[PDB]
């Protein structure tokens, strides 16, 4: 449904298709795409506020349809930086599988990292919960004391028993 | 804006002009470390990005060493969760130990009648 | 009670539905229904503080309804942005499952 498109060895007109959902207007005449793309996303810039957030990613897409010689460098550039964003949507020949891959790999990288910047806490964390198993053996200790106790009662009862020869 | 810093570099880069070689080659220099001037292969691909690559490299121990006095906690927790078990360990033996006395103990009982 | 709705194989004129509830007003003229939303959108935005915790909501649902050629990638991504923030409510194709869940 993504895409729009005709075929036929001689052109076909289907007369079932009926009227289009298009409406006629006029506007500026522009020369190539790419300027109508620059005016309309300048004219959406320029009323956002500096501290906006989409800001950025408006001036990327700006940037990306500049043309001018000696520009190529830059442009794969800000591309990169585009895709690294998610914002680009890689035109599945080499980027999808490398520019994105590499994007996972230092994504799944530096989470030791980021938790380790702030993981003081996980060496007192480990070791409340390893005590949660290793305190119980003072209990397991004060039974075993109480056993002991027991046993040394009925040893000391036939002490008492014996003592009377 | 963060690339304007790159717009500037990518400008200076195209200047032309008498007696500006060390100026234009410190720029290129720090264009190429950045990763934006994509070396064209035939000396700085080999030797600025791979000192580039070495000195980055180099001090990813200095760089979590600048925050890992937590490094030393870790490191004492995660031995201790295996060193604390012996306390466990130990009051097996105890219990083992105390199973063997209440034997001997008994034995002394029955003997101690004559 | 979400649909409005009218049927029939030749149209059916009930004459007991009486009287709607609309009133005949005028306003300006537009050659589409985007620019209307549009205009009406810019002006409920512009009249609000720059820290007003709406405005995002008002600027992505304007960016929404702009119409051009080459602007494929940034709806697309703009739309994804307002999907996950609970604004767009997906229109149950596949974006009810895969971008929310």
Known sequence: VVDRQTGAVVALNDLSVG??????????????????????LTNVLSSMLPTDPMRPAIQGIILDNIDGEGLDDFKEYNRNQLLI?????PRNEKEQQIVQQAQMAAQSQPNPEMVLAQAQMVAAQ??????????????????????????SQA???????????
């Open 126 to 151: 480990a070791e409340a919960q390893k005590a949660t198993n290793e305190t119980a053996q003072t209990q397991i200790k004060a039974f075993t004391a109480q056993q002991d106790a027991m046993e």
């Open 85 to 89: 964003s998610g914002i680009a949507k």
């Open 155 to 165: 040893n000391t009862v036939y002490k008492l028993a014996q003592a009377r020869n």
């Open 19 to 40: 009227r289009y959902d298009v409406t006629v207007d006029v506007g500026p005449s522009y020369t190539a795409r790419r300027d109508a793309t620059v005016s309309v």
